Amino acid sequence: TSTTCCARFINKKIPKQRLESYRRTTSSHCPREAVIFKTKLDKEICADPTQKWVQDFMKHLDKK
Amino acid sequence: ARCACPARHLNNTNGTVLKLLGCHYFCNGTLCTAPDGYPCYNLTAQQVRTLTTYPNTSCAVGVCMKGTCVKNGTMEQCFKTP
């Protein structure tokens, strides 16, 4: 059971051009459900998976 | 923005959400504070000194308010996982 969790979420949408192919889903046991993405500047960013931008990117990464 | 990054939480044998140790975390080169209402563990200095990979103390559950883990009365068997 991974104990890495996101306390806060990125407020706005991040253009896909700014994101790498990194992605990890956090435990369902986390206080807040989050997906972790990485920017081309190598910053890990917590994203709310109930926002459609996030859902769109996760799909885009599977289709790749 | 910079504080939207993952951080290590503590687990428990109680079947409840993972919780932050205290209300502060460091990621993306930034010292951050958890949001108000965030579930946290408030451990004594002595409890922190003995914190391990298995439960060995009663851990005070709390809620983050302005960087302070305000104890709520609930106790749990907390532990860390690398």
Author numbering:
A (entry chain B): 7 to 70
B (entry chain A): 22 to 103
Could you give the paper's own sentences about this structure?
Evasins are chemokine-binding proteins from tick saliva, whose application as anti-inflammatory therapeutics will require manipulation of their chemokine target selectivity. Here we describe subclass A3 evasins, which are unique to the tick genus Amblyomma and distinguished from “classical” class A1 evasins by an additional disulfide bond near the chemokine recognition interface. The A3 evasin EVA-AAM1001 (EVA-A) bound to CC chemokines and inhibited their receptor activation. Structures of chemokine-bound EVA-A revealed a deep hydrophobic pocket, unique to A3 evasins, that interacts with the residue immediately following the CC motif of the chemokine.
To verify the contribution of the CC + 1 residue to affinity, we mutated this residue to Ala in CCL7, CCL11 and CCL16. Moreover, CCL7(Y13A) and CCL11(F11A) exhibited substantially increased affinity (~10,000 and ~200 fold, respectively), suggesting that the interactions of the aromatic CC + 1 residues in these chemokines had imposed an energetic penalty that was relieved by mutation to Ala. The complex of EVA-A with CCL7(Y13A) is isostructural with the wild type CCL7 complex, except in the immediate vicinity of the mutation, indicating that the affinity increase can, indeed, be attributed to changes in side chain interactions. Thus, we conclude that the preference of EVA-A for CCL16 over CCL7 and CCL11 is because the aromatic residues in the latter two chemokines are energetically disfavoured, a phenomenon known as negative selection. Here, we found that the preference of EVA-A for chemokines with aliphatic CC + 1 residues results from negative selection against some chemokines with aromatic CC + 1 residues.
